[PDB]
C-alpha cells in the first residue's frame, strides 16, 4: 500500500516467533533482559515505532468459510481477517533510578569481576520489576510515591485493570440476584459456599465466560498466585497414605503456572501468548551522575513501554476469592 509495503507485497505475490525490526541498542537490551527470567520467555515483547496506533494481532482465529449462490443472485462479501473488540494502545515512559554509596562501591571495587555482577544484578532487578508492576498497577499517576503503595501499584495500567475497565462481563466479582444486587460480596468457595471447590469454579468459568473459539484450544493456562495454590494442595498432602501429583499441578483440567507478587485473591485463565508488552524502538535513555553532596553515585534510566492484552475475548479472570467452610 505504502511504497515499501507495496513493493514487499508485490514481491510476496510473485525463527518465525519473535519480531525484530533492526539491530539497535534498546532492542538488544530488551532481548538480553527477556533471556534472563523464564516467564518473560513465554511472552511477547514487541518493539513498535509509533507513539499511538493499532495492536498487532497474535493468536487470533475465527470462522471464515461460507458458501454463496453467485449464479444469478447475491455477491460474495468477505469477512474481516483481524477485527478485534477494541484496539488502541497508548505507550508512555517509566523510569527507574538508583544510587550506590561511596562506602559500598569502594568495598565492591576490591574484588575483581564486580561490573559484570552489578550488571547481572540490575538486569535481574529490572525483569522481576516489570513483572510485578505489570500484574499490579491499577492506574498511572505522575509523581508516584512509594510509601503507601509498596506493591508498585501506581506506575502504569496493568492487564488486570485492562480487563476491569476496557471490557467488563469477562470478570466475575460478586454473586447477585434479580433483587439482590450483591447477595454475597466475595465468591466464597468451600463446603457450604458458592462452589464445591476451585476445580468446579475454573471449570464452569472456562465453560461460560470465554468464547467457543479459544474454548477448544491446546494452549490454555490458569495463572494464579502462590497462596491459593498452596491452600488447595496442602490438605491433600497433609494426609496418611501417589506423591507425583505435586509435579505438574493441574487444576480444573488445566495446567497451572505461578508468578511472584500476583494478587492472592484472583486468578486469570487465558493462553500464555495472548497478553504482551510493547516498547518504543529507541527511547532507552540513560545518564550517570557523581554528586558528592550526599557522597553517592546515581544513575537515571528511562524507557517507554505499554502493557496490552491482544484479544479481550481470549481469557477471563475471577477476583475476590475466599476459601472457608461457611456452615
Amino acid at each position: 500500500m505504502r511504497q515499501e509495503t507495496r513493493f514487499k507485497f508485490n514481491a510476496y505475490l510473485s525463527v518465525s516467533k519473535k519480531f525484530t525490526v533492526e539491530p539497535s541498542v534498546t532492542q538488544t537490551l530488551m532481548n538480553t533482559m527477556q533471556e534472563s527470567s523464564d516467564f518473560l520467555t513465554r511472552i511477547n515483547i514487541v518493539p513498535v515505532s509509533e507513539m499511538k496506533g493499532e495492536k498487532i494481532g497474535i493468536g487470533v482465529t475465527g470462522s471464515i468459510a461460507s458458501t454463496t449462490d453467485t449464479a444469478g443472485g447475491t455477491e460474495r462479501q468477505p469477512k474481516d481477517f483481524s477485527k478485534l473488540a477494541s484496539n488502541k494502545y497508548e505507550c508512555d515512559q517509566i523510569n527507574f533510578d538508583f544510587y550506590i554509596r561511596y562506602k559500598t562501591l569502594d568495598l565492591w571495587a576490591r574484588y575483581q569481576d564486580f561490573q559484570l555482577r552489578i550488571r547481572n544484578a540490575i538486569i535481574k532487578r529490572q525483569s522481576l520489576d516489570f513483572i510485578m508492576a505489570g500484574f499490579n498497577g491499577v492506574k498511572r499517576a505522575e509523581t508516584s510515591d512509594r510509601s503507601s503503595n509498596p506493591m508498585l501499584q501506581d506506575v502504569a495500567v496493568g492487564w488486570l485493570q485492562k480487563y476491569r475497565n476496557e471490557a467488563p462481563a469477562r470478570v466475575m466479582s460478586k454473586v447477585t440476584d434479580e433483587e439482590g444486587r450483591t447477595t454475597s460480596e466475595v465468591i466464597r468457595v468451600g463446603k457450604g459456599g458458592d462452589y464445591a471447590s476451585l476445580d468446579a469454579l475454573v471449570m464452569d468459568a472456562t465453560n461460560n465466560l470465554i468464547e467457543p473459539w479459544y474454548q477448544e484450544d491446546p494452549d490454555l493456562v490458569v495463572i494464579v498466585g502462590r497462596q491459593l495454590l498452596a491452600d488447595k494442595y496442602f490438605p491433600i498432602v497433609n494426609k496418611e497414605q501417589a506423591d507425583v501429583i505435586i509435579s505438574q499441578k493441574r487444576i480444573g483440567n488445566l495446567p497451572a503456572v505461578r508468578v511472584p507478587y500476583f494478587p492472592a485473591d484472583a486468578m486469570l485463565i487465558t493462553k500464555l501468548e495472548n497478553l504482551s508488552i510493547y516498547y518504543m524502538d529507541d527511547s532507552h535513555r540513560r545518564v550517570i551522575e557523581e554528586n558528592p553532596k550526599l557522597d553517592r553515585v546515581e544513575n537515571y534510566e528511562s524507557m517507554n513501554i505499554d502493557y496490552v492484552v491482544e484479544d479481550y475475548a481470549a481469557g477471563c479472570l475471577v477476583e475476590k476469592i475466599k476459601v472457608g467452610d461457611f456452615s
Binding site: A169, T176, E178, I187, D194, D204, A205, N208, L209
Partner: protein, 94 residues
C-alpha cells in the same frame, strides 16, 4: 481386643516371614469386609419421624433440570446481563 491378644501369640501366624501381616490390620480388614457386606445387602426403610417428615430424595416438583437457565453462577451472570439488555431494549415499547 481379645481377638488381637489371641492373634499376637507366636503360634498364630499361618504365613511365614513373607506376608506376615500385622494382626491389627488383619482383623480390621475382616471387620471391614463383614460390615460392608451387611451395608451393601441392606436397604433404608422409611418408618422414622425425622426421616419420613420432609427428607428422602432430593425433592418432588416439576422444575429440576429441564430449564436450569441459571444453574452455575457464571451462566446466571451471563443470562442476567442478556436479560438486562433485552429489558433496556423493550423499554422502547410498552
Amino acid at each position: 481386643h481379645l481377638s488381637i491378644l489371641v492373634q499376637e501369640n507366636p503360634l498364630a501366624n499361618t504365613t511365614g516371614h513373607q506376608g506376615y501381616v500385622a494382626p491389627e490390620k488383619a482383623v480390621m480388614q475382616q471387620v471391614k469386609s463383614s460390615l460392608e457386606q451387611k451395608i451393601k445387602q441392606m436397604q433404608i426403610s422409611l418408618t422414622g419421624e425425622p426421616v419420613l417428615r420432609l427428607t428422602g430424595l432430593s425433592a418432588a416438583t416439576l422444575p429440576h433440570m429441564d430449564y436450569e437457565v441459571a444453574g452455575t453462577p457464571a451462566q446466571r451472570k451471563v443470562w442476567q446481563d442478556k436479560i438486562d439488555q433485552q429489558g433496556a431494549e423493550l423499554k422502547a415499547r410498552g
